[PDB]
Structure 1
């Protein structure tokens, strides 16, 4: 593989699209390498990780319980609800909703949860309170994946998403059990985890959340590192390319490959 930024260029040139990337130490926030890290990109389903971060914050403040059962109707469902569509009679706990939303990318589960923290407004307030002054959620599923050119709604920057995930996973913002729960959800991803784990070299830890949207929007936020440890946060977004999903998948894999092959101390 080529060096990581060389691979990143090649990808932008082949896709005719923008790539954004940061590789950061989870423990300190040391930035190892970055590319359009301060440019905005639609978050897509990657926001589900931050959303469950806010739910955990509510559980920690005594405002919410992972066990609280929520009951919802058929009329509340939205597109792609592989888990939530199966529990119309029995409802789902707040904890199950976060696992469906992060590990299966269930969209109704995300919506039901979004209502509990005050909707997109309330999730943007939580970010501001955590010191993220860039990320902004403004719409619900599935409209938040719309990705129009130059629209800042429902977008983040690579470096702002990395700094926020680091704060949720390691500062004293979430209790320790909550930090561990947020982490375990991403480890248990069922959409791309297994696939990715199977092609990674032996020794590599992987936790992730992937997303896709319109106009070629594609992305992943992940915990990765050699020696079976969640060493660094890697955030890769792609936007404004006409390419097929398969090509978009391969290009992000090729950058991931480059990143992994040329990993620095």
Structure 2
């Protein structure tokens, strides 16, 4: 609705930074509303949905198994690894690592799964093959969060991420059991409370994944809708602000409040 665009512009003003926004109808792929749809933004942890989508396509193809246990050691642990640090002794299965990477944004789990897949170049090859010629992963955790101005490495565009998310979630690329497993991990997100979830009405569905990075970068990709079903994809990215984490969260939650008021 154009009143949400008023709130996105107001957020650009309050944060003193670019905000990219898109609202996409999940059924038809129709772009309902957009602001900077084709400017690049750092993906940060929102790439971990894409990563487990690549993992699940290998599971579907018989090239990977969800129950396979990955062992790793203290040498692999990078900053913000709340779940992998606690499982050094016995390792974790592919399924556990995707739950940790999505639900808890665990950085080591993402690196371990990127190794399983053949690294950033293979996730980017996977994206290219499903028609996304924009999103690219170039580095590993934690480097990919750097968000240096004008750098195309590890970026997407709001319109590209929304279209890719839609394909992953409703297209024939993944088996329905796999699409459902990706949706379940996103629904179980534990780390995005102050963002769209704080504006979500009772009874609504949300599956999402947040990200934060350097230079004020913050973002969220989400599939949400009334009556327990997703019917729209919302993607929101910001970078460049010098505002605190709480101010960045606050403005994204106010963009959410506007889009839900005007649904």
Structure 2 Cα separation of the partners of residues 161 and 40 of structure 1: 10
Gaps of 5+ in 1: none
Structure 1 Cα separation of the partners of residues 104 and 193 of structure 2: 11
Aligned ranges 1:25-44 → 2 under 5 Å? 25-44=25-44
Gaps of 5+ in 2: none
Report if aligned partners of 1:193, 1:208 keep a CA contact under 8 Å in 2.
no
Report if aligned partners of 2:4, 2:258 keep a CA contact under 8 Å in 1.
yes
1:89-119 deviations in Å (ceiling 9; x for gaps): 1010001000000000000000000011111
Q: Aligned residue for 2:249? A: 249
Runs of 4+ deviating beyond 3 Å: 193-199
1:170-216 deviations in Å (ceiling 9; x for gaps): 11100111000000000000111587545422232111100001110
Structure 2 Cα separation of the partners of residues 203 and 64 of structure 1: 36
Report if aligned partners of 2:196, 2:256 keep a CA contact under 8 Å in 1.
no
After superposition, the Cα gap between the structure-2 partners of 1:35 and 1:182, relative to the gap in structure 1 and judged at 3 Å, is same
Structure 2 Cα separation of the partners of residues 197 and 3 of structure 1: 20
Report if aligned partners of 1:193, 1:207 keep a CA contact under 8 Å in 2.
no
After superposition, the Cα gap between the structure-2 partners of 1:19 and 1:195, relative to the gap in structure 1 and judged at 3 Å, is closer
After superposition, the Cα gap between the structure-2 partners of 1:6 and 1:197, relative to the gap in structure 1 and judged at 3 Å, is closer
Deviation at 1:152, TM superposition (A): 0.5
TM-score normalized by the length of structure 1: 0.96
Structure 2 Cα separation of the partners of residues 193 and 65 of structure 1: 31
Structure 1 Cα separation of the partners of residues 35 and 195 of structure 2: 26
Report if aligned partners of 1:187, 1:193 keep a CA contact under 8 Å in 2.
no
Deviation at 1:166, TM superposition (A): 0.8
Q: Aligned residue for 1:144? A: 144
Q: Aligned residue for 1:128? A: 128
TM-score normalized by the length of structure 2: 0.97
Give secondary structure in 2 for the equivalent of 1:3: helix
Deviation at 1:72, TM superposition (A): 0.6
Q: Aligned residue for 1:83? A: 83
Structure 2 Cα separation of the partners of residues 220 and 60 of structure 1: 27
* Root-mean-square deviation (Å): 1.5
Structure 1 Cα separation of the partners of residues 151 and 198 of structure 2: 36
Report if aligned partners of 2:43, 2:219 keep a CA contact under 8 Å in 1.
yes
After superposition, the Cα gap between the structure-2 partners of 1:197 and 1:252, relative to the gap in structure 1 and judged at 3 Å, is closer
After superposition, the Cα gap between the structure-2 partners of 1:63 and 1:110, relative to the gap in structure 1 and judged at 3 Å, is same
